[PDB]
Every structure is written in structure tokens, then in C-alpha cells.
Amino acid sequence: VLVALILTPALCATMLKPIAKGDHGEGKKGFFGWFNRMFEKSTHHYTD
Amino acid sequence: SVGGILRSTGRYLVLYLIIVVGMAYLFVRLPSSFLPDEDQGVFMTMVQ
Amino acid sequence: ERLSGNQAPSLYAISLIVVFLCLAALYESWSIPFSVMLVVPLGVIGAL
Amino acid sequence: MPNFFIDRPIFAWVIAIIIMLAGGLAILKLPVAQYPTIAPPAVTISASY
Ligand SMILES: CCCCCCCC
Ligand SMILES: CCCCCCCC
Ligand SMILES: CCCCCCCC
Helix, strand or coil: CHHHHHHHHHHHHHCCCCCCCCCCCCCCCCHHHHHHHHHHHHHHHHHC | CHHHHHHHCHHHHHHHHHHHHHHHHHHHHCCCCCCCCCCCCCCCCCCC | CCCCCCCHHHHHHHHHHHHHHHHHHHHCCCCCCHHHHCCHHHHHHHHC | CHHHHHHCHHHHHHHHHHHHHHHHHHHHHCCCCCCCCCCCCCCCCCCCC
């Protein structure tokens, strides 16, 4: 929790790459592209 | 005098290393003990 | 003498590392601390 | 505290490095075994006639 309150936020501000609005990694081509489309679809099933 | 040293710089970078090497020499040169012998106002004489 | 003796050099190395880190946190820079760290040999030379 | 270390990322790293360093030095000194003292202690009185 101390790492999550001190270090993790500091890194998230400095390291993480900017993500565009609406981008959920569905546009990716390969395994990750398939998994992101699969997971986003599984969330709709779950929420419903 | 401080203002003049800032203009030079290069000379005092070399003078620093001489002090660091001089320090390194004196360190190894100086013998090592644990605790000095103190005058306790008393001593003993062995007879064998 | 034989087992457990010369253990000072390592604790001095830890001290200089932990001092550098604490200085880096104070000034919020990896470079600035060295301005303070380079004064240590100017003091040690006198003691020697 | 989170907002403090977002502006001070080096401070955040310094806290992490010091913890990791302290841990590294502990590993050297720490003893090793299968279990700790889990067995209850016993005292034996031995006599001979
Ligand atoms: C991630 C698991 C979702 C499963 C939903 C099942 C509803 C028929
Ligand atoms: C002790 C770790 C120092 C790392 C310096 C990084 C400079 C960008
Ligand atoms: C900004 C980079 C920090 C370096 C961390 C070093 C960990 C031993």
C-alpha cells in the first residue's frame, strides 16, 4: 500500500505512455488484439 | 577571489584530485590499532 | 582477530550511498547531491 | 501523500532504493533453516542405580 501510494503514482505520471480517448487496444493486430476484443466482449456479457 | 576561481575552474579540478590522492596515501600510510593504552594511576610488575 | 574483523569499509560505503540518496530526495535531483558529496575528502584530509 | 510524490518522483525512488538496500543487507546476515523453533522445549533427568 505504501509502494502504491508513494512509488506507483510517481511512475504512472513519468513512465506510462499516453492513451487516446476510446482506445481499448482493439486496434492492435496479433494475440493482444484478439484478447482485447475477447475481453471487452466478455465485459458486456458480465455487465448484462 | 571566489568570483575569480569560477572563471578558472579547470585548475582547481586538478588540485582537488591531488588532495584525494594525498588523502588516499595518508589513509594507507597511517597504522591501525583499537584503543590506546591509558594512564590509570596504577600498574603491575610480574616476577617469574 | 581471525574471524569477524575488518567490516568498516562496507558500512562507510553504505553511509555514502544512503547520504547521496537522502540528498537526492531533499534537492529532487541525482546531480545536485554531488555538490555536497565532493566536500567529504576536504574534511578527511585534515583528520588524517 | 500521492500528490506529493507525483511532483517528487526522485524522492519516491529514494524511499524504494533505501528499503531494497536495507533488504539486501538483511539477506546476508539472516540465518537459514527448514523450520524455526516450532518444537516445544524438553528437559530430561538421567539417573543410574
Ligand atoms: C467474464 C465472465 C463473463 C461470463 C458471463 C456469463 C453470462 C451468460
Ligand atoms: C542510484 C540510482 C541513480 C540513477 C540515476 C538516473 C538518472 C536519470
Ligand atoms: C530513475 C531510475 C531509478 C533507478 C533505480 C535503481 C534501482 C537499484
